Amino acid sequence: FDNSTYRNLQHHEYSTYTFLDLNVELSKFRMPQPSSGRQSPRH
């Protein structure tokens, strides 16, 4: 154990699409969304 080293270095290799790629990856883990019963408030 030691406190000398900084351990938050993975964000140095994040690209323009990292957040949305993670969202695409997370898409398969989610529960089915609720529905209001119509396609939009204008329907």
């Binding site: 209001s36 019963g37 119509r38 408030p41 204008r42």
Partner: protein, 62 residues
């Protein structure tokens, strides 16, 4: 200029009720037409309805 020949073109009288006006018109011999008072009907205003979960009352802008 705009010219007129009837002396009553600017005559407007004010009354508290419809019955007072009718009585005044009758005692002066004037034929009259009475139109009933128009009041706006009471309305149901709900601010929260602007953000409805499943209704069309949801607004798209503020």
């Amino acid at each position: 200029w705009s010219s007129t020949a009837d002396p009553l073109s600017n005559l407007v009288l004010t009354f508290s009720t419809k019955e007072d006006a009718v009585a005044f018109a009758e005692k002066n011999g004037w034929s009259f037409d009475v139109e009933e008072r128009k009041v706006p009907k009471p309305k149901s205003k709900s601010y929260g309805a602007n953000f409805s979960w499943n209704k069309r009352t949801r607004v798209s802008t503020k």
